[PDB]
Nucleic acid binder design. Structure first.
Lengths: 130, 106, 173, 193, 204, 251
RNA sequence: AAUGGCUGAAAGCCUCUCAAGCCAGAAUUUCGUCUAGAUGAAUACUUUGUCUUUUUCUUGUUACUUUAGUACAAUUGAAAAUUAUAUACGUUGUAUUUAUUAUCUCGUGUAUUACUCUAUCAAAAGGGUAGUGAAUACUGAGUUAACAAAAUUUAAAGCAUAA
RNA sequence: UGUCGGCUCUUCCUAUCCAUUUCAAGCAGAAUUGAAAAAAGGUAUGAUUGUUCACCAUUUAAUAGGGAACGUGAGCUGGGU
RNA sequence: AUAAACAUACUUUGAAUCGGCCAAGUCUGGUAAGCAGGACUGGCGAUGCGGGAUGAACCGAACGUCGAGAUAAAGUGCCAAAAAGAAACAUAACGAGUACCACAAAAGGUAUUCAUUCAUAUUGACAAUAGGCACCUAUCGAAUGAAUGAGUCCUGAAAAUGGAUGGCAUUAUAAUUUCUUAACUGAUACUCGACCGUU
């Protein structure tokens, strides 16, 4: 049986546009293609807007006691109560999201040390097995 | 020694269905997949370096080059227009062209 | 697609200069809105632009383009046989947004181009007045479905390589 | 129109065990094991538990679910659900197909092989050619009585085809079939138990 | 530089005409292609209608001399070269040169079975197709039209699957030990300074 | 306009083009389908036609109205002196048909077989298989041969014996022998090579291959006629006597 | 193929399916058989063992002859299958060309290798055993660079001998 | 641009005459009639007429209908025009 | 009102020409014709260039020699320069695919999508089962039945050398209908600049 469902309160991840790699919460299902994401604008900056399902991805978290057409006030309370931001950052996608930001601030000298250091560490790990 | 260039493919000249304008040559720089990544390369040097099997009795170089400049984007898939000192030979279609890093603007 | 509020009056022998003709016209721009407005007057009240003055042609915007509403567009279109009156239900957040859906649905299901459809009125219906069989399945509060066979999403055209290394997989998504 | 979700299920009695591995159901019961492959790329089959009685308890049910799809596709949920029901029924109470023999003037002899995996029809309408008619793996023909045979097996798809195979080999050709009512027919289809 | 490398394309689970368009465009761009398993490609249409299209194709033949007429190649490795050749310039040096850089083989020959494979997301049947649509493998259609060697490839592939299967397990143990050995020296105190650098940039 | 009367076409298109062969011996283009549940055996032979006679044969068939005294039939006489096996070759099934793998040859090779590898024997040095023979018993060569035997049993599916005739036993003036590859239809490839190795240098008689009252196939080259007209080549109808420019042609 | 059937929904029943899945059924289609046939493969002998061109001898080919020129072993390239893919994760977000810290010298042993070479068993293998070299990690220290130069990738003349 | 027919020969269409596989009948059998798949095979001998056409006497499983510059004159004949 | 001084009004001498053809939100004769003949206009003739694959007339636009730029008709899976996203009725078929254009009709379908009207839908409508084909009882519990209209699909749909959405090919499209994005490609036409000639 499928685990992740497009439901009300399902936490979704934006994959393209100005808010790429930003969390969102579904609070309405217009049809099979369009949903209304209201990932709290005061928390993640995602405005209340209608997006196509081809632009977002599902996650393993659902915010409890979220009804369709929830106001930004009550929805913000349920979002922080569930500690969604805390749990998301420990997931494989969350560690991959912070990695993209982290490696994007490297300079030429930064890439020099990593390439030299890891190449020495990787070679040593090969020696350790006989 | 080191690699200080990005290979670009000489796809062909600027053309239409039944015409051809060899003044401008189209290039596909490696790693540029959209026209928004082109602003960096507009103005960078481009060299078509080829090898000629000269004879030991001559003094002409065995490695000659034609240089040019990337001038403008061409389409939405990161294709560029390059104008060289001499028009590229059509025999060099699909070969690799070095896209240098100068004139630098950083 | 934009909505306009247009008013005018007729100043000649036949019409007294104290009757104001209001309208709410959905047009791509404001020049088309007046063009639609004038033909409505010419075919219904014998009023022509040469004997009339426009008063106010102002755009109309959605008060709450964040609330999902169920619409009900009453319209008449022309087919090969004759003329028919149709009623269609749509779910959208803006009045102009739903009208574009109606135009795209009419031009696909009925193959009717835009210069055959006249929009009589558009209202908002409740959560139980929806009669479209497909659209009636998405009005409930307890609606859920696993969106499956997703194509993996590309962040932007920047990373869209023509040839990829390794196997390609879909997503339970 | 497109249905958001079509749900069908089959109940598993206590004697049979069902294990599903990528739309490949194997059902083993008191009479044997039956395997099948439902290679439809738009059905999810998974064992679960669901209450099926208005005021009854929870029981083990194999659930077949088809999400958004046209009526051309949603018609397969009941088809696949019925097949597993026959698979469950086949290994619990095997199917039997009582076949009778009708002739006008020429007696017909049914020479069933010793094992029961083959038959032989002789002197059909005074003919010299002998109809052999093999049987599928898992179907056994037996002589119930005089001018009557029955087929035994676990798979209703194998049994019914074998029963129809014998009839299809004994058709009257180039003659008025409204008068020459000859051949091996099917009286009724029932269960061994 | 000169691109002497070869882009190995594993044609499994792809579309015949969508692979060709991507390959034929990139053959003109000075790239050497080798398409392994050109009989696992998928063409829209059941085996019944796919034979009808082939029946029409076999009709085209020079009436006065069949040996001059269109030559219909039944091998799937030749049913892709024809499809690729249709999207290349005809009767010029540019098109002939761009076809000499293309190869299908039915199985996976000695050099091309241990190279890195590449896929074409624009041609995968999981993206461009409705799952309920019935398709047809080129190898399956090849037998219906008279391709004799459909059993040699099926057997040769099987012995290749059970050769790579034991290689994969052997390297799995080698990689597991290396990964667990790298974690040991990453946690060593003598390597603390280097790990501090990597941890800052998120590598470790 | 349609032809007035319909008649069958003259000649057969199953044999076009009609190109004359180059070698007198005709290579058989197939072999009987192999069965792996039988003792390996040779599937062919090679003989020289001598002529034809006629034999009065007593009919053993039943339900036939043939005379009891015996029917009259023609019979061809095919003299088949024993052939000498001088090697064996294994074949492998690839995606381009059978591909020969190796060819293990015998230690001693007759001069008849040597003549096949030259065009002017009387001028040749006649050193065919000279290195193969003088170095046959070396440890390097013996180890190499064992590799060839072992290679066939592992990566081959067809075994054929390279058997040749003996020109000394026939009235033909030809001295060079005729070489034919005879397949070994029988058990697994392991026991096919064992059968093949046992046959090296051993003459094979025709009775070992073919039995009694056995139906066989014959492949050979027909009698030459040279340039011929349309009437003989295709059997078309000769033109009326009045015809200008000739009678024996297709109008 | 036409057609007759099996199970079976849609449409609780019915139904051969303008549904998924099967069977039987032609002077039919494809294998199998026959003829012509391209790129080819195996073996025998003559050779050659980094490579080419212009001449040139011969009925013709190959080896062969002369004057050159050029490189000299040692980190490149593989899970398979499925996609409504058991469960969990979604591991996000740049395929080839294109991932080596300038060269050289002195340093101690150990360990590693789809690395090279030698011997052996095997083998139409990124094979096993033994030995040796190369590179790398433990892991250093020391010299030099300024102006010049850092290109083979193909040339020219012969016919003594052997097949 | 050699203007009818016939002779010789090859090929193509199916709107099928026969043979093969099927369904229906006011199909008991036999003989038939209507229709589907299917163009790979076969589809004649003569009196009269230049005739295409026609009408007869037979034989045959059947003696189907047409195209290819109203196929085919540096292929024939010259009976007609 | 607008435009007009290389405007306006001409005078003299004279060449060639009066076989025309095409398009159409046109007409007459004709069953009809790439047939015959007319009213108004625009074209080919006398005309190249970009597009429709190829085409005297169709679409854009009319040409001194060039450099650079936005454009026109129309296109953006490959041949072929140039697109990404959104929604639907299509597609189990030589179905669909660039007007003039190189073809298809009447009719039929419990094939499919949408809409309108009417009746039954509850504590119980239909189908099924059991009891006394219609009728009534219980379980079964949610949509059921009827008519009509508009799109798409299937049948209707048979000709002679082998072949033509241009070809390869596509099939929740790379087809069709409509959209969105300060997207793109491109003529000898437009803008700027340089030079040659006429006025």
């Amino acid at each position: 049986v499928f685990s992740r469902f497009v439901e009300v309160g399902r936490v979704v991840l934006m994959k393209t546009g100005p808010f790429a790699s930003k969390l969102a919460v579904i609070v309405e299902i217009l049809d099979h293609n369009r949903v209304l994401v209201d990932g709290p604008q005061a928390i993640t900056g995602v405005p209340r807007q209608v997006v196509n399902l081809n632009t977002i991805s599902l996650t393993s978290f659902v915010v409890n006691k979220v009804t369709r057409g929830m106001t930004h006030k009550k929805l913000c309370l349920r979002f922080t109560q569930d500690a969604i931001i805390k749990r998301f950052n420990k997931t494989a996608t969350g560690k991959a999201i912070e990695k993209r930001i982290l490696r994007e601030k490297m300079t030429d000298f930064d890439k020099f040390q990593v390439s030299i250091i890891n190449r020495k560490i990787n070679a040593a790990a090969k020696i350790a097995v006989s | 020694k080191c690699r200080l260039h990005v290979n670009a493919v000489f796809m062909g000249f600027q053309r239409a269905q039944r015409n051809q304008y060899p003044n401008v040559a189209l290039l596909q720089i490696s790693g540029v997949n959209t026209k928004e990544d082109t602003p960096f390369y507009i103005g960078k040097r481009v060299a078509y370096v080829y090898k000629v099997n000269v004879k030991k009795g001559s003094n002409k170089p065995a490695i000659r080059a034609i240089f040019g400049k990337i001038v403008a984007p061409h389409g939405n898939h990161g294709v560029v227009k390059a104008r060289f000192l001499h028009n590229l030979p059509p025999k060099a279609m699909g070969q690799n062209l070095k896209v240098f890093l100068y004139p630098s603007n950083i | 697609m934009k909505e306009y509020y247009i008013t005018a009056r007729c100043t000649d022998k036949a019409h007294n200069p104290n009757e104001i003709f209001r309208s709410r016209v959905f047009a791509p721009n404001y020049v088309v809105a007046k063009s639609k407005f004038w033909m409505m007057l010419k075919k219904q009240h014998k009023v022509k632009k040469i004997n009339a003055e426009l008063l106010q042609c102002q755009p109309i915007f959605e008060k709450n383009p964040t609330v999902v509403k169920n619409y009900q567009i009453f319209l008449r279109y022309v087919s090969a046989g004759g003329i028919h009156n149709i009623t269609k239900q749509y779910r959208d957040v803006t009045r102009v947004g739903a009208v574009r859906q109606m135009y795209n649905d009419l031009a696909s299901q009925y193959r009717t181009r835009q210069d055959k459809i006249q929009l009589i009125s558009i209202t908002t219906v409740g959560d139980k007045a929806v009669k479209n069989p497909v659209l009636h399945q998405f009005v409930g509060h307890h609606v859920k479905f696993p969106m499956v066979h997703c194509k993996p999403v590309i962040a932007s055209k920047r990373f869209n390589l023509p040839i990829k290394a390794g196997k390609l997989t879909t997503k339970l998504c | 129109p497109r249905l958001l979700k079509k749900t069908e299920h089959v109940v598993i009695p206590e004697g049979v065990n069902i294990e599903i591995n990528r739309k490949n159901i194997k059902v083993t019961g008191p009479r044997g094991s039956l395997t099948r492959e439902f290679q439809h790329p738009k059905v999810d089959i998974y064992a679960s538990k669901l209450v099926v009685k208005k005021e009854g308890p929870k029981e083990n049910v194999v659930v077949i679910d088809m999400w958004y799809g046209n009526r051309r596709d949603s018609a397969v949920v009941r088809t696949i659900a019925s097949h597993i029901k026959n698979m469950i029924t086949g290994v619990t109470k095997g199917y039997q197909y009582k076949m009778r023999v009708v002739y006008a003037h020429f007696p017909v002899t049914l020479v069933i092989a010793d094992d029961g995996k083959s038959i032989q029809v002789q002197n059909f309408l005074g003919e010299k050619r002998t109809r052999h008619i093999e049987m599928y793996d898992g179907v056994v023909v037996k002589k119930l009585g005089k001018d009557e045979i029955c087929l035994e097996g676990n798979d209703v798809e194998k049994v019914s085809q074998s029963a129809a195979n014998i009839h299809a080999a004994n058709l009257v050709r180039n003659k008025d079939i409204r008068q020459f009512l000859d051949g091996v027919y099917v009286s009724e289809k029932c269960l061994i138990e | 530089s000169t691109n002497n490398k070869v882009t190995v394309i594993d044609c499994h689970g792809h579309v015949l005409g969508r692979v060709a368009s991507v390959v034929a465009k990139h053959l003109l761009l000075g790239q050497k292609f080798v398409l392994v398993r050109c009989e696992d490609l998928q063409v829209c249409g059941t085996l019944k209608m796919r034979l009808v299209q082939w029946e029409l194709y076999q009709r085209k033949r020079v009436n006065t001399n069949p040996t001059r007429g269109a030559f219909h190649h039944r091998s799937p490795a030749d049913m892709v070269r024809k499809a690729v050749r249709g999207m290349l310039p005809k009767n010029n040096y540019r098109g002939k040169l761009a076809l000499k850089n293309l190869k299908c083989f039915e199985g996976c020959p000695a050099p091309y079975d241990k190279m890195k494979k590449s896929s074409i997301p624009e041609a995968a049947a999981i993206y461009s197709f409705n799952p309920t649509r019935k398709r047809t493998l080129l190898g399956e259609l090849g037998t219906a039209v008279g391709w004799k060697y459909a059993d040699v490839v099926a057997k040769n592939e099987a012995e290749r699957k059970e050769r790579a299967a034991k290689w994969y397990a052997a390297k799995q143990l080698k990689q597991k030990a290396v990964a667990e050995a790298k974690e040991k020296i990453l946690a060593d105190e003598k390597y603390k300074a280097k790990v501090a650098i990597l941890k800052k940039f998120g590598y470790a | 306009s349609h032809r007035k009367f319909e008649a069958p076409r003259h000649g057969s298109l199953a044999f076009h083009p009609r190109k004359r062969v180059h070698k007198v011996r005709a290579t058989v283009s197939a072999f009987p389908k192999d069965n792996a549940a039988e003792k390996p055996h040779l599937t062919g032979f090679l003989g020289f036609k001598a002529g034809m006679t006629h034999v009065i044969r007593e009919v053993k068939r039943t339900n036939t109205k043939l005379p009891k005294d015996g029917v009259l039939e023609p019979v061809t006489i095919i003299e088949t002196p024993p052939m000498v096996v001088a090697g064996f070759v294994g074949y492998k099934k690839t995606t381009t048909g059978l591909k020969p793998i190796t060819a293990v040859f015998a230690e001693h090779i007759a001069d008849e077989f040597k003549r096949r590898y030259t065009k002017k024997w009387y001028k040749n040095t006649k050193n065919q298989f000279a290195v193969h023979t003088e170095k046959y018993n070396d440890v390097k060569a013996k180890s190499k041969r064992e590799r060839q035997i072992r290679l066939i049993k592992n990566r081959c599916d067809v075994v054929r014996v390279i058997a040749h005739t003996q020109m000394a036993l026939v009235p033909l003036k030809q001295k060079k022998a005729e070489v034919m590859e005879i397949q070994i239809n029988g058990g697994s490839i392991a026991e096919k090579v064992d059968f093949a190795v046992s046959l090296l240098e051993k003459q094979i008689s025709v009775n070992s291959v073919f039995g009694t009252d056995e139906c066989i196939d014959v492949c050979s080259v027909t009698k030459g006629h040279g340039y011929n007209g349309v009437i003989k080549r295709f059997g078309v109808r000769h033109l009326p006597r009045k015809t200008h420019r000739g009678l024996r042609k297709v109008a």
